[PDB]
Amino acid sequence: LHHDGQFCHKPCPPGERKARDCTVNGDEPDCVPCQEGKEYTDKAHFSSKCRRCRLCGHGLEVEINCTRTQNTKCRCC
C-alpha cells in the first residue's frame, strides 16, 4: 500500500531500492540501482525509494560527488 516495504520479504542492499512497492499479492519486485549522481542509499532497506544526493553557493562547494551508496560530501561557515 505504501513505499515503506511492509509487504517486502527481502531487503535491498546499499546503492539499490525496490523497483516498485511490494504488494500483498504480486511477485516481489527486484532491486534496482539508485540514479547515479542524483540519488543514493547508504544502508540496506525495504523501500522503493532512494535518498536525494546533497547539494552545496551558500559558502560551500562540492568535495566528492554523490555515489549510489554515499551522499555528496561538501566543503567550505
Epitope: 511490494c22 500483498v24 544502508k43
Partner: antibody, heavy 132, light 111 residues
Framework: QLQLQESGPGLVKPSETLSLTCTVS??????????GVWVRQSPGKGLEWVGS????????????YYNPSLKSRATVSVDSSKNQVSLRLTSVTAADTALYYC???????????????????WGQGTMVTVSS | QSVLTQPPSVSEAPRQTVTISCSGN????????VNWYQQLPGKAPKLLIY???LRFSGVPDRFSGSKSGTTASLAIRDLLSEDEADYYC???????????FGGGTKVTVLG
Amino acid sequence: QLQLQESGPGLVKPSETLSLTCTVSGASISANSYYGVWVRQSPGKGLEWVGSIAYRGNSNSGSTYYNPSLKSRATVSVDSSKNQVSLRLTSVTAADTALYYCARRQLLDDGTGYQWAAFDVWGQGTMVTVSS
Amino acid sequence: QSVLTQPPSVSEAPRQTVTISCSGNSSNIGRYPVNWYQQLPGKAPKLLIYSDNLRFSGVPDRFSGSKSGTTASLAIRDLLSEDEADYYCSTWDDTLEGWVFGGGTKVTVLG
C-alpha cells in the same frame, strides 16, 4: 501494547504434522497489516528463523516466505476472526524438536527517515518434542 | 554452524566490560544491518539493539552496538549480575535469501 502467545500439543510423533497457533492481543492484525514470523530454538542451541507471513486485513490475504532449509514442510497462515497466526510443519523428525516462538517483524525508524526490520515483539514460546 | 560466527562464551567480573563479536561476510553483515537479541535464562529473546547501533525501547546505556566491515559488535560495560544471559546477533543473508542468526554467546558475570 502488543502481546503474543503460542500454543501447541507439546508432543508429536515422527512423520506426523505439527500445528501451532499464535494469538495476538492488544491490537488487530486485520486492522491494516501484520508481518508475523516463527523462530525456533532446539534445547541448548541457537535461533533459527522458520518462516513469515505479510498479512493485509483489508483483502484478508497474506504472502508467505520460508527458510529454504525447511524444504517446503512449513506453511504459515492467518485466521483474522481469531486474531491468530498459525504454523503447520509436515513430516517431522527429531530434528524439529524445539521451543517455537512467534514474533512480529516491525520496520523501525533510525531517526533519519530510514527504517530497518527487526523482531520487536516475541511470544513466550511453546515447547515441541518429536517422539514416539 | 551458523553463517554468522559468535564466541560461545565471554565473561568478566562485575563492573567490567565485555565485547561480543559477530562476524560474517559480504553476503550478510557486509551489506545488511545487524540486530541483537538478549535471551535471559528461561525467558524468550528480546530485541536489544537494532540497525547496528540503535538501542531498542528502554534498553539501558551500558549496552551498545556497532558494525564495521563484516563484523558486528555488542559491548556491555559496567556489567551487572542480571546481564548474565545469551545474546544473539541477526541479519539478512542474500545468498541464502533469509534471516540468519549467530550461534549465540553466553555472558557470564564471574562470581
